[PDB]
Design a protein around this nucleic acid. Structure first.
Ligand SMILES: OC[C@@H](O)[C@@H](O)[C@H](O)[C@@H](O)CO
Ligand SMILES: OC[C@@H](O)[C@@H](O)[C@H](O)[C@@H](O)CO
Lengths: 13, 423
DNA sequence: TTACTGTGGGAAAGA
DNA sequence: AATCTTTCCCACAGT
């Protein structure tokens, strides 16, 4: 199955 | 009594008049022993959505200026467990219950939550229940593998929370708010956890079915917004340390497990919290099989559920409470011709309800609380020139009708189901 | 300087 | 046997 979702990348510490 | 026409004003204007109440909770709760309290976490909470709530307040306002602030209580369906008061854009109001617990004096394997709503003037809105919650003695420790209830299957919902030395006061919850994942002190996200597959990134990805095991690559996806974290690998934690033993792949992720999420590109980088912000934290190695993490990188995972109710007092505002709301599971269409019956399954069917295939009502009977056999109205009598645009599909050409249950009171409960004229 | 209170983890017994 | 659940108990880090 396939899913779509904008990826949110967390910043770095 | 609901007239054919007032229905049309509602079906056309669903979101203007429809009151929606949603109760979010976890599927499991840890029992408390002796005189202790282990609070349900994440805290069961209630969202009041829809503009119908503003119009409900308007009605009660007018009504009581001839004869204010709405309060709610929540309990676990036991008479020695005190009920607790709930403190309060599409969202009208919000409250969470942070200090619910269940004691070992209660012997039930399962319980549910019951929230009751009143206005300050004292008119009861009514009582609403959550889904089944299973009592557990302690997070499971099984290394292998029957039950399955405590496992986490791909494509189901989870909350993720974070304790800090099990003491400052605080607990924080994974929650997306304005396009960003954060760690909220009051609200929690229900996320869909996916077992990521193969084809390396990003927006569009493949998923497998199956239970989630430690060592698996996983995708966390927000219910509400559709926003996802980067693909992550789930690891068990054992106080402040990430475990990495190959054998962990045999270990199912389970309710209330302490766990961590390592970046795929970088083994030492973990999903981590700093106050309310979500960040990438770099751990320090202890071992080929062991990492030292900050407290903010140790999460607790639990399956969650939701109970949604929808109603609108379509005629006047009603004297009786709108509870108990019925809920409809599925449809069953047996036989053919005109005399063919359609049955409904669910909960809290009362004798005082009629099935509305659209704007027209229909012949209904009543078997019991969880069953309701009824006739289908002749295809002709369902659309005309006041209904037609909302009733005929703009793609197939076939007629598809929204099903409703309506109380004689005048309150309609939109089922969420629409019937497809194919049979 | 003790009393008290959730929370996680370990001890013992039970299954 | 070995392993995992249930119940009881206490340390920890706050008020
Ligand atoms: O010390 C614990 C307490 O004695 C408990 O075992 C009670 O019998 C019961 O759970 C109270 O409901
Ligand atoms: O969940 C708590 C409940 O008391 C249950 O676990 C009993 O201990 C057991 O079901 C008795 O048959």
């Amino acid at each position: 199955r396939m899913i779509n979702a904008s990826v949110w990348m967390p910043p770095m510490e | 009594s609901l007239t054919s026409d007032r229905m049309i004003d509602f079906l056309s204007n669903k979101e203007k008049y429809e009151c929606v109440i949603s109760i979010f909770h976890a599927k499991v709760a840890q029992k408390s022993y002796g005189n202790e309290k282990r609070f349900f976490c994440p805290p069961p909470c209630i969202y009041l959505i829809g503009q119908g709530w503003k119009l409900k307040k308007d009605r009660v306002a007018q009504l009581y200026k001839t004869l204010t602030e709405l309060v709610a209580y929540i309990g676990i369906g036991s008479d020695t467990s005190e009920r607790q008061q709930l403190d309060f854009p599409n969202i009208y109001d919000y409250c969470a219950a942070k200090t619910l617990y269940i004691s070992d004096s209660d012997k039930r394997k399962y319980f549910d939550l019951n929230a009751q709503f009143f206005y300050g003037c004292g008119m009861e809105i009514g009582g609403f229940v959550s889904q089944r919650i299973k009592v557990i003695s302690k997070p499971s420790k099984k290394k292998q593998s029957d039950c399955k209830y405590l496992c986490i299957a791909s494509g189901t919902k989870v909350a993720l929370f974070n304790r800090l030395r099990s003491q400052t006061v605080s607990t924080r919850y994974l929650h997306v708010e304005g396009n960003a994942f954060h760690a909220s002190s009051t609200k929690w996200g229900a996320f869909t956890i996916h077992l990521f597959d193969d084809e390396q990134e990003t927006d569009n990805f493949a998923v497998r079915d199956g239970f989630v095991y430690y060592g698996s690559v996983v995708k966390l996806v927000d219910s509400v917004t559709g926003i996802a974290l980067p693909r992550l690998r789930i690891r068990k934690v054992d106080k402040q340390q990430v475990i990495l033993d190959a054998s962990c792949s045999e270990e199912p992720v389970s309710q209330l497990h302490k766990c961590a999420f390592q970046m795929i590109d970088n083994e030492l980088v973990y999903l981590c919290l700093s106050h309310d912000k979500i960040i990438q934290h770099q751990a320090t190695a202890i071992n080929e099989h062991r990492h030292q993490i900050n407290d903010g990188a140790a999460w607790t995972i639990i399956s969650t559920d939701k109970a949604e109710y929808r109603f609108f007092e379509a005629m006047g505002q009603v004297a009786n409470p709108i509870s108990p709301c019925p809920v409809v599971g599925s449809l069953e269409v047996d036989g053919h011709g005109e005399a063919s019956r359609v049955e409904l399954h669910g909960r809290d069917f009362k004798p005082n309800l009629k099935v509305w295939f659209g704007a027209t009502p229909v012949e209904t009977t009543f078997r019991s609380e969880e069953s309701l056999h009824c006739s289908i109205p002749p295809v002709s009598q369902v659309r005309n020139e006041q209904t037609h645009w909302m009733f005929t599909n703009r793609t197939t050409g076939d007629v598809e009708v929204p099903i409703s249950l309506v109380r004689d009171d005048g309150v309609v409960y939109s089922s969420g189901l629409t019937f497809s004229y194919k049979s």
